Symmetry: none
Subunit: 293 residues, 6 copies
């Protein structure tokens, strides 16, 4: 019985700068405890849309300084269909290149919707004997697929199928982490610790937004309910202070400051600090270039 | 350790003649085994959309002949905002009258969205010591709230709040049943048996439909995954034969016939027949006129 | 032994209708458990600003239906110096009349500032042998003094001294409740249960607002810190859902609905329900018309 | 059980010279009893405003002769927004340089307000296992942030956030000392000894001053009330003689003389002399350049 | 061993309204405890100058409502030599008439200076076998002698001698009370309880004022020193709040309000309330019309 | 129980030749009984005005021949502001030099007034654990401060404060001796023996003189009253013969003859002779260079 820790990077658009600021501060705590990256402290990383461009980068081993550098120097240009995806593609090739999803150092689950069939899809690494087809994809294509919503980006054809943004259906990536730890990893729920670094989003479009918000809250409350018998085993690092804030470079200042303050609040809790004071986790890859089993 | 059985009536619009026909066919077994209604064989009833109306009618003790009579004699008229809700209101008062949600004979969970706050809400009978405010509502108002979607019906103001249809977020009422049996009834998942009598539904609206279908499938697959270690403990009575059917009174014929065939297929499985061959279930009401504890 | 329960009503201006709604739904539980009013379940009541006109009304025995009737029928007119205190005065005489502060059924602490000396003052019922001069005041004058701020109301001269609103300094009436239970009631902090039904408020004025908000948060966090070793012994019923609300009669609707939802959430927690299921509180008055000791 | 002694320096503006004269006299006793500085006799140092530039200097190990030299040779120049923070900045770099807040020899708590979020903040040395982010700051920036009020100094941007003066909210640094000894140090209140070397300050601005004075007195009286059961465990060295004084170099004379007289009065009390006749205090740093634990 | 209680009415000029208001509030406590006047709770009453016009009135049995009526309706006119004492004489005859000093109900000591010899004199009632010549004087003449200072009033010739104001030498009437209790009443100092209701006063004249203030403080500190071994046996009701007051009818308001607040503070202390909860004191007159021995 | 003997040198101006002559005559008995100086027979020495100078000289160990030499050879020159203090300063440096007040061989109390604050001050040797700041002063500065009255000498700035003559307030140094022996030495009054070698002094100035004389007599009579139960324990060596004398070198003759006659009268009383026939007193210094405890 050792703790199965999940990092559920929730977010959307340009508020992602909050998610990368909270992650630069948490990273420091990992280093100071002797880890190579913040991806060595977690057994699973789940993200949706932009949270997936950060989740893949975290698991690949990318320094969080560059994930933040993306949002405060390239954030305007990146974040036909109101965007052309070319700058995002350039930065992602800059980062990854031609690496496949099986080259990640941490198991990830990237939910997304198959527009062709119109059905949920999850792009996962080979962390179970049964996952054998998603480790061959370009990390660039996975990143372009997860962060591709209608009226935001053209749908990305990874292969024969067209995929849209994952936040449309699985707007909470903390239910995916808990579910994946319950059926792929056969983990008892008492051993699951979820850290969800999410953020709040900023007649028909009104209805779509209402449905999306309601569907994120429904799944978040389900995760909170399943983790109530075990105290402090699900903690969400949200900017609950911006809603209490009595008061785009200025917006960068507010986002950065909110991220730093939320990470400071989180590091003051011993159970959050206990995510990073452990021996480096050992992975079990069942396929791909890093096959251990 | 006795089996906690859940009835998850999934349904949308007129295809409800399928859900009411399968329920009318299962009533036959329920009575032949010596029960008063099909609501005496289940510990929880969850439904969204028209399923909610059928779920409330099932739990209230209404004969399933009249629930079917609603769909093949009043189905066209009932199923500004393309409908006026007056015929549905008349039939619901005809059925219920001025009964409160605490007069139900079976615990129910009716998910719905608070349009005012734009957040998930569940209307629940007083079945837990913690449910103390939803047993006072009109069953008519609950039925008008659950089956009230934009472009279908005006939003129903039960009280100070306006509510929209529950199928928008909790499109699968079998995840609600399983969760309730986990966070309210403190039931071990091996003791939970879910019977989901659902049916298949018939650029922006395309995206909304895709998102709704994807969100129903995601939650359905989560329920199927959590119930795989226990064989045959989650069975869905779906019209998987209409998709294999090589070929509005005619539509009534197809819906009825499909319901009868699906119920015939279900009754051929001993584990489905074991839902109805048990002593009548004893309820524990913690508030309202039927308070037992 | 006996749990010392405190009700810390925080309410500024028109969003007092939230405080009056949460208390109409908490009195229901109070009556359903067999109490005469919601003032029989608490051993101390503290309010500042409108929370004091509600705190005095609660302790006097006024039905909470009329406290709500004040905010949705007289709220605009009541809430020179932008407001003639005459309306409130009429409603307060219609409620109280010529009753003195010693006629209250529950000990209250009403903080306020002496503008003459410019120093903190607390108007308290004679609930300690050392309180002997504030039980002689008009409840009407106390209510007009607590809810009297510059640029809102003229300063009220209760006697030879002029008093201004208490929210200016003691913006959190939950630190006053905890302190009074600590220095007047000689209560061990483990026996103190605080229920704070507050609400969020809506270059020099900016600085004043910033200072007031900072001073409310500082004292609130001090109360939260002193009550962390004892779980769930300080619960604040705040409209944390309006800050999550994706969406003046309309404002009345939002305030009412938020109050009802927050009270519903609070009543779902057993420790909140345990405030009202206890034997009636026996008072010890050490002076005034009701001196029992 | 050994005494936990707190030094709560309160000093607004030029009447800080009082706080420096009282300290130089109290350091004499400190040295005569065999200590290196007056920071070796205390287990916590709290300060607000100028009292924070003195509190940091005391804890850093700066000789109190230079803290007094600041007020009688540089006091006019230091004490757009009526004051260019440049002078103070030069003197603070001349004192500290590039030392971080983790290089202090005594735990300090410097309250301040985050203008960006508009919320209370406390800059603390790493004296608890939960304080891990404020030991990295420049002492110069902390000093420029604590002593930065509107209409006095421009707001100081330590990092991504702008901070204003701490005296605006936490005008009494003796409630902060008592609270920190209660929630961070887990100290029994009978073991806490507070020595507060404060001083008295000299239509809208009138209201702001009234609110600030009322908020200082409220918190001071709360500290006095919590420390009444333990005699002489909270002593405030205030210039209560200048208000009894029957009668800017002349002002320097009055301030100096008042400080010397108040320190003489304080040293005549054996319980004050017992703060300095003890073995040197041993610190427990849980992070930073001096981490011992 | 029963407590010997002394009332030392210190005061001066028109601030006497403070002393008369603190005494109306303390009187109420005497009545509420069942005494005829505030002169039945004390064994000795010492006053200087105006405090003597109040001390004589208190001991004579005059209602304190009229002593206050003197200061807020006749205060300007009463308070050649800037002030011909005709109005004061009229009001004193109105009060007393032709009563001798031996008709007082409480022993009093009125210090004064014999201008003829230029030596201290005390006008005392026959409360010792050795006091046999002062009980024959007019109370009007004693009142006109005690409140008669140069540059204020002409010197009053009671008999063959001219007398000036007593505040010139015995500016503190609490040292006189303690001394009398020590040599006339042969009381142990542990049994002496002094309640001093005084107030603060508002090149050669500067020197005279400095000397007078220094001589009042010297004697006050001597009384405080002799009463330190016995806690709370010397309490001075001073307006220490007007020196902390951040802010001639207005002056009447401040004086009255300060008196009411100081009396409220005093009545909150159980040892002050214990002055009035005792059986009525029994006097021993050794000469005059009320001779008991 | 051994006798606590006090020497209260009262004096003013050149009449100080009486005190110096009486002291020179008592030195004869002191030496004839085997003591080093007249300061070895007393436990405390209190003086005001020129008495302070003589008191400091007596305690320092100065031969009384030189104290008399000051008054009959330098008396005219020493005794802007009618004097320049330079001759007195020269003679005092001649005597003391750079010795601090802690180098005295006998505890002394020198009353004086702080002109800055306008409050009583006493300069005391470190004779109690609580006296820790007056032993560092120059004896020359103490002597120049005690003997510095307006219209006589410029005010002497010992440090940051200006001091005036002590005879203005504490015109009788025998009440100071008795009080000190009561509040600092914790001596029973039956063990206190006071020997007061004083002398009689020679429209606004008339009032000042009257007040000063009245204040000296008031305190003298208080000392006489407190020492009546113990016979001959307070004896004042006054020139009561010059007032009976039926009849500036001639004035020197009268002063010295009166001193010799008064000392002759005093030495004829056995209780005065018993001050000097005792073993040398042992001092307890609690601070300064002579610290014994
Ligand atoms: N995702 C994935 N699936 C693979 C791989 N190799 C084989 N498969 C198989 O494809 C099946 C369905 O693919 P899908 O992932 O797109 O739909 C998935 C996905 O839409 C959804 N789902 C998967 N993991 C989830 C999760 N952790 N949380 C919430 N929902 C989830 O449930 C569907 C069924 O998952 P399954 O694990 O039982 O079967 C896989 C799995 O058996 C592979 O490399 N990746
Ligand atoms: N101040 C500080 N907090 C840190 C550090 N590392 C983590 N934290 C955590 O940041 C949280 C937020 O602190 P804040 O400084 O922004 O506001 C603080 C401050 O506004 C207030 N507060 C703290 N100590 C106080 C005190 N002694 N007196 C009065 N008020 C105080 O309580 C807020 C929350 O305190 P907390 O201790 O429970 O959690 C800290 C603490 O757990 C750190 O290096 N410094
Ligand atoms: N539904 C309900 N809730 C009540 C009642 N009296 C008090 N409550 C309390 O109000 C809280 C929030 O009500 P909500 O129903 O509008 O949001 C609910 C609902 O949106 C969602 N939820 C509840 N049961 C669910 C379920 N079985 N499946 C999926 N989602 C669910 O979780 C939210 C919080 O659930 P909770 O039970 O822990 O707290 C309730 C509950 O404790 C009551 O009579 N009915
Ligand atoms: N005189 C003195 N006081 C000191 C020293 N170190 C500390 N103190 C303390 O300073 C307090 C006030 O000093 P002050 O001398 O200016 O006022 C003194 C002085 O004005 C007056 N006083 C002291 N001794 C006296 C006496 N014997 N007779 C008459 N009056 C006296 O009482 C005031 C307070 O006395 P305190 O002894 O209780 O407190 C001292 C004393 O405790 C010190 O070296 N000398
Ligand atoms: N005051 C008074 N004195 C009387 C009376 N009948 C006789 N006497 C005698 O006159 C003597 C001196 O008169 P005095 O009161 O004007 O001076 C008094 C007075 O100036 C002063 N004094 C008295 N009581 C005091 C006190 N309580 N506090 C401070 N100083 C006081 O001490 C002087 C001596 O008092 P004493 O009591 O030993 O002797 C009385 C006393 O024996 C009489 O009716 N009143
Ligand atoms: N409030 C009050 N005080 C009374 C009464 N009769 C006597 N008193 C006494 O008046 C003193 C001054 O009270 P204040 O109301 O003017 O300011 C009060 C008030 O400003 C503040 N305070 C009191 N209770 C508080 C509290 N519970 N929380 C926060 N602050 C508080 O402390 C000040 C002094 O309190 P205290 O209890 O030690 O002494 C009282 C109390 O002993 C009375 O009828 N009411």
């Amino acid at each position: 019985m050792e703790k199965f820790q999940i990092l559920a990077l929730s977010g959307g658009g340009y508020r992602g700068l909050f998610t990368a600021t909270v992650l630069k501060e948490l990273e420091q705590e990992a280093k100071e405890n002797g880890h190579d990256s913040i991806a060595d402290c977690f057994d699973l990383i789940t993200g949706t849309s932009v949270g997936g461009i950060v989740a893949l980068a975290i698991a690949y081993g990318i320094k969080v300084e560059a994930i933040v550098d993306l949002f405060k120097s390239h954030g305007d240009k990146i974040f036909g269909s109101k965007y052309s995806n070319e700058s995002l593609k350039t930065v992602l090739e800059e980062w990854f290149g031609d690496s496949i999803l099986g080259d990640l150092k941490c198991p990830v689950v990237i939910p997304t919707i198959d527009f062709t069939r119109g059905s949920p899809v999850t792009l996962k690494t080979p962390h179970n004997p049964n996952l054998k087809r998603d480790w061959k994809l370009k990390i660039v294509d996975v990143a372009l697929a997860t962060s591709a919503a209608p009226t935001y980006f053209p749908r990305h054809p990874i292969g024969p199928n067209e995929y849209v943004a994952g936040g449309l259906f699985a707007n909470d990536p903390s239910l995916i982490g808990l579910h994946e730890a319950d059926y792929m990893f056969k983990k008892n729920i008492q051993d699951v610790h979820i850290l969800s670094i999410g953020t709040l989003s900023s007649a028909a479009p009104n209805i779509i937004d209402l449905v999306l918000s309601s569907q994120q809250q429904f799944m978040e409350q389900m995760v909170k309910h399943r983790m109530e018998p075990f105290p402090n085993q699900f903690y969400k690092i949200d900017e609950q202070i911006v809603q209490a804030s009595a008061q785009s470079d200025a917006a960068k200042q507010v986002l950065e400051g909110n991220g730093i303050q939320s990470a400071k609040v989180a590091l003051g809790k011993d159970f959050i600090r206990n995510y990073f004071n452990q021996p480096s986790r050992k992975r079990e890859w069942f396929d791909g270039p890093q096959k251990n089993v």
